[PDB]
Structure formats: structure tokens, C-alpha cells
Amino acid sequence: SPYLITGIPKDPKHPLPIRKDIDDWYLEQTSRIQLTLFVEALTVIQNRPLNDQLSYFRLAGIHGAPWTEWDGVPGTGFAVHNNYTFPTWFRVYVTLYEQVIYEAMLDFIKQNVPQNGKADWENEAKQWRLPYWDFARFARDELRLPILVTMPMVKVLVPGQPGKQLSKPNPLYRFQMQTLMGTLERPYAITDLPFDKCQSTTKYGLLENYNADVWADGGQNWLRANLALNEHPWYQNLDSVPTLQDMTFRLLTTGGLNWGEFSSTRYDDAPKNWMNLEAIHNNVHNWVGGFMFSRPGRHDLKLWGAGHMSSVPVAAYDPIFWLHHCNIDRLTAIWQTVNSGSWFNDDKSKVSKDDDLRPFHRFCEKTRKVVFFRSDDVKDWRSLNYDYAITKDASRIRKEISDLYGEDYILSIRYSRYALGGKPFQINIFFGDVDGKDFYDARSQNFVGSVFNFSGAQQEQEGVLSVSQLPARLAVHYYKKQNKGEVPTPRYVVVNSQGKAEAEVKVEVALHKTDYRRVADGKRAEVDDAYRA
């Protein structure tokens, strides 16, 4: 310490290497030196001890729990949420992860590759960059978690044993410790959802009413995550379009937003410009991990279940976290490319531009001193010696955006992250009557879409709230069709981690129509008595 974050060092045989789509990269590798390097290096990092600040646990620990120091910066986590430095704090955080993995790759080569092959393996390490998960791209008819994340094991090369491939536990599948995270040595223990009783990260694996020993490793219910990722209005199960892809398309193609509007859910005391990067990212966290531990009533089919990615304090432990944030960085770079003058340039985000991005250090070549990273340091992501295919070929970026992700009606949503004292919740919006026992997801009658509060005696910063936006065109057309042309009143339910409706929460929900005009104000829907909080 300090650990200087630089990105992977420049090598002239490797001009601005790209971060590839992880599904494309996995298929290239198997259709495997880089795959071996990534698997082996990430395994080594996951097995480093807690007192090593470049262990996987400690790197994930920068984000949230267990809220310790990192790199000599005293330990809420370090992560930036609901502020305009969300994209840039995470830009540096993803680069730290990438850089540590690359360093571990070089160590792996020194340890395991014979002298005669070191140049070949080093070539591959120097070309590798952290792949991104394209959560909004149809997987090589539907959106999906990465192929590699759904694989318990992965086959790798053994250097010096040509045609000596071997199957190993996949470090992208889960992060597993040797004991329950609640029992780790001080001060690293993780001690709402029983994350203290988990040894491994899980997706939808934590459900009430099963033995607590099941929670030690609740499994990776990637089929369930995929279903959530493809959320869309209920009626489309009677032509569907996944809302996540439409939201991403709109984020990338809508012109005229300032940085403050694009960068964050933060609303400091319009609606057309409330589709923002952070809100989409919050929904993806919910969809990957699950946040509901139980459901009232009797149900044969159990669609709930909770996991690490839905929860701010522990989401960073799931290896997909980094791949998600890699794409969030990619989306930022794309938006920057097509909105090149909009950088901390509005009267709301300007104040935050010079925030130190603690705990991340760099060397100042002007002061000749170690300082914290600041947003302007990473405005050009290529300064960190990586790029994306889509931003290298800028000339045709609009066409590529259309090929990947392509009156109007929109829903606006304004809410307090601390409406429940800081606990997470999901805002579900419906057109028409709400089923008092089924108000949760796309299988719930009349469901149109959700907004997840990715948060987790406590109140928000004075004057600050949070915003999101949902597409509503197709769902309003269906509703009119079934309802004699009535413009629907949006109905909402605020759902907590017990699958109950929090009657006392008020959210501002409105429907707007195209220049957008407000055409209906939303109202809370009642649910059954056994389903009320």
C-alpha cells in the first residue's frame, strides 16, 4: 500500500485491447489459454486470505459489508449509490478488479508455464480484458445470464501438458468460503436475509421454511434469474418484448439528457429524462439475485427466493457482480460517445465532479504524490488501457445500438430509497385490477413493470429522492383494447422481502403521453389482508 490502480499496463503488441462480450469470448475460447488464465487467476484470488487486501473477499468488501478499511483508507460502504459519481466510482472499481486478475495471471504463468511457453501465455494475458455481461442482448429469443456463469465446472489447460485438459470448479459460478460468512474472523464477519448463514453466494436460493443448513449454499437458480431478466407486461403471455432491452435501447438512444439525468437515480429538488443508468442497474441486481425470502399464503409453485445480488451489503461477493458492472461501464462509454459534451456539466452534477473516489489511489505525475482517483481521471476510459468494440468503431455506433437493442407512453416513478428506513423494496405497477394474492411479477395479472429500490431511524439526504422510468406504450395499447379505450390509472404495490405489501409507502407514479404530457396519476392498490405488511 498504497496499491496504485492503473489498469493493465500498456504493451505495444496489444493496442487498446477490448473487453469482450463474455458469451462471445467463451464461445471463441471453446469453439483455451485466456479462459484458463481467467479461471486459474480468479481461483487464486478467491483463495487468498482475509488479511490480503487483494483477496476476492476484500475486493468485494470495498463495496459494502463487512465495512472495513481498504488500502489504508478507514472504512455505509465505499460504493457510490444515488449520486452522479455512480458511473465513475464503479469505472475505477471494475478496473481494480481487472488489474488484480491480470497480475494474478502473470503469477500463474510464472508458477505453472514452462519457460518455452511463457511468451505464448504472456501474450494471451496481455490481450485479455475483463469480459462484460450483455444483459440486454438476446443470447446467441431471450435475455440470459452468461453461459459461463451457469456452469458449475469449467475445463482448463494444464500448461506443459498438451492435450491435458482438466475440469475445475468455476470461480464465476459462485464465491464459496470455507465457513459461514457470519463466523469469519474479526473484523471480517458478515453479521433481514440470512446472509450470515451462507458459505456461498446464491441466486434465489434463500427461502423461508427450509432447513437453515440449506442456506449455507442455496444454489444458482439461473433459470429463475433468466425468467426475471426477461420481465415484461403480463398480457404478453396471452408478442413479447423484454422490458430490460427496451429500457437499455431508450437509455442509449434518447438524446438531450445531461450527465445528472443519465448517471444516477438521484433527484435533487423532467419525467421524460428519468430513464437512467443506475435505475436499470438496480433492476438487474434484483432480477439476478432475488430479494423475497418468503411469500404469504399457500403456493405450489414457488417463484420467490433471495440471493446476494439483490442486496447492497453483499452483492459484490457474487462473481456476476463484476460482469454486470463491466457492462454498466460499457453503457456509460457508449452514452458518452453519443453525448460527448455532457460530463458533470449541469448545475446539479457539477458539484460532485471533484469528489475523491475513495478508497482508490493513483500517482499524481504533477504533484508527484499519491492521491485519490477523481471522475475527470477516467472520463476517457482508454486511459485505463481498455476499450469496447462498440466504441472503437464509433462511426456506426447508432446502427450497432439498433441492431443489438432495437403515441408513446411512459411511466415515471419518484421514490425515497428510505421509504422503509433503508430496507429494499420493489415497486410493482399494474394496469387494471390487482390480484390481492399475486402482485409480484410478469405472471401476476395486469402487471406492467417494476422498479427495484437497491438499498440496504434512517433517512435519505435532505432534499434528495430517486427516479426511474418504465416503457408503457404496448401495455397501454393492450389495456385500452380490453377496457373500451380507457387510459389506465397506474396502480402500484410496494412489496417487501416477505412478499407483503407495505400499505403506508407512497410513491409518485404517473403516466405520460406524447413532448410528453401527464395523462394519469398513479394510486396504491390494496392487497388481501393476509398479504399486507
Q: For binding to a second copy (CB under 8 A), which residues are involved?
A: 27, 30, 141-142, 147, 150-154, 166-167, 176, 178-179, 199-200, 207, 210-211, 213-214, 216-217, 219-223, 227, 230, 232, 237, 240, 298, 300-302, 305, 437, 442-443
Can you tell me the distance from the alpha carbon of 208 to that of 48, in angstroms, rounded to the nearest whole number?
Answer: 33
For residue 482, the SS3 value is helix
Identify which of residues 315 and 413 has a Cβ nearer to ligand PER in the complex.
315
- Report d(CA 3, CA 490) in Å as an integer: 50
Q: Which of a second copy, Cu ion, ligand PER, none binds 189 (CB below 5-8 Å, type-dependent)?
A: none
Place of cell 448517471: 263
State in angstroms the smallest separation of the CB of 79 from ligand PER: 6
Q: Which residues, including other chains, have CB under 8 Å from residue 281's CB and lie 6 or more apart?
A: 324, 328, 454
Nearer to ligand PER, 77 or 131 (CB): 77
Count of residues that interact with Cu ion, criterion CB under 5 A: 1
As a three-state string, the secondary structure of 111-172 is HHCCHHHHHHHHHHHHHCCCCECCCCCCCCCCCCCCCHHHCCEEEEECCCCCCCEEEEECCC
Selection from ligand PER, a second copy, Cu ion, none that 415 binds (CB < 5 to 8 A by kind) is none
Q: Which is nearer to Cu ion, 81 or 295 (CB)?
A: 81
Q: Which is nearer to Cu ion, 83 or 99 (CB)?
A: 83
70 vs 478, beta carbon nearer ligand PER: 70
Question: Which class for 144: exposed (0-12), middle (13-18), buried (19 or more C-beta within 10 A)?
Answer: buried
Q: Which entry of a second copy, Cu ion, ligand PER, none binds 240, CB below 5 to 8 A by partner kind?
A: a second copy
Q: Rounded to whole angstroms, how far apart are CA atoms 414 and 384?
A: 35
* Shortest distance, position 220 Cβ to Cu ion, whole Å: 18
Contact of residue 447 among ligand PER, a second copy, Cu ion, none (CB under 5-8 Å per partner type): none
Residue 111 Cβ vs a second copy, minimum distance, rounded to whole Å: 22
Q: How far is CA 197 from CA 190, 193, 200, 205, 410, in A?
A: 9, 9, 9, 12, 41
Q: Least distance (Å) from ligand PER to the CB of residue 81? A: 6
**Closer residue to ligand PER (CB): 18 or 79:** 79
**Nearest distance in Å: CB 199, a second copy:** 6
Q: Output 81 or 250, the one with its CB closest to ligand PER.
A: 81
CB neighbour list of residue 87: distance below 8 Å, 6 or more residues apart: 263, 264, 277, 328, 329, 332
Shortest Å distance, C-beta 318 to ligand PER: 10
| Nearer to a second copy among residue 200 and residue 332 (C-beta) | 200
Give me the residue label for grid cell 471494475.
94
Q: Considering the complex, state which of residue 174 and residue 324 has its C-beta at the smaller distance from Cu ion.
A: 324
Question: Closest CB to a second copy among 88 and 230?
Answer: 230
* Least Å from the CB of residue 44 to a second copy: 20
**Euclidean distance between the first and final Cα of the chain, in Å?**
48
**Which of 218, 215, 220, 247 has the alpha carbon at shortest distance from 231?**
247
Q: Give the shortest CB-326-to-ligand PER separation in angstroms.
A: 12
Where residue 284 falls (left for φ over 0; alpha for ψ -120 to 50; beta otherwise) is alpha
Query: What is the distance between the alpha carbons of residues 252 and 482, in angstroms, rounded to a whole number?
Result: 32
Binding marks (x or -) toward ligand PER, 70..99, rule CB under 6 A? ---------x-x------------------
**Closest CB 281 distance from Cu ion, rounded Å:** 5
Residues in contact with 228: Cβ distance below 8 Å, sequence separation at least 6, in sequence order = 286, 287, 288, 290, 441
Name the residue nearer to Cu ion (CB basis): 79 or 139.
79
Answer for the pair 277, 264: CB distance below 8 angstroms, yes or no: yes
Closest distance between ligand PER and the C-beta of residue 150, in Å? Answer: 21
By CB under 6 A, residue 279 contacts ligand PER? no
Q: Give the distance from CA 273 to its chain's centroid.
A: 21
Piece in contact with Cu ion (CB under 5 A), picked from 76-84, 290-298, 434-442, 458-466:
76-84
Minimum CB separation of residue 153 from a second copy in Å reads 6
Pull the grid cell for residue 487. 387510459
Q: Name, in order, each residue with C-beta under 8 angstroms of 489's C-beta and a sequence gap of 6 or more.
A: 511, 520, 521, 522, 523
- Shortest separation between residue 325's beta carbon and Cu ion, angstroms: 6
Partner from ligand PER, a second copy, Cu ion, none contacting 219, C-beta within 5 to 8 A by type: a second copy
Q: Which is nearer to a second copy, 53 or 200 (CB)?
A: 200
For ligand PER, which residue of 60, 145, 288, 315 counts as binding (CB under 6 A)? 315
Under rule CB under 5 A, which residues in 226-255 are in contact with Cu ion?
A: none
Cα 3 to chain centroid distance, Å, stands at 25
DSSP labels for 442-479? Answer: TTSTTEEEEEEE------PPTTEEEEEEEE-HHHHHHH
Residue with CB nearest Cu ion?
79
What 8-state DSSP symbol labels residue 311? Answer: -
Please give the Cα distance from 495 to 346 (Å, whole number). 34
Q: Which entry of Cu ion, a second copy, ligand PER, none binds 82, CB below 5 to 8 A by partner kind?
A: none
Single out the residue of 18, 54, 73, 79 in contact with Cu ion (rule: CB under 5 A).
79
Measured from the CB atom, the residue of 325 and 524 that comes closer to ligand PER is 325
Smallest gap from Cβ 217 to a second copy, in A, equals: 4
The DSSP string of 344-380 is S-STTTGGGTT---TT-EEEETTTTEEEE--GGGGSS
Q: Using CB under 6 A, list all residues that contact ligand PER.
A: 79, 81, 315
- Which residues in this chain contact Cu ion in the complex, by CB under 5 A? 79
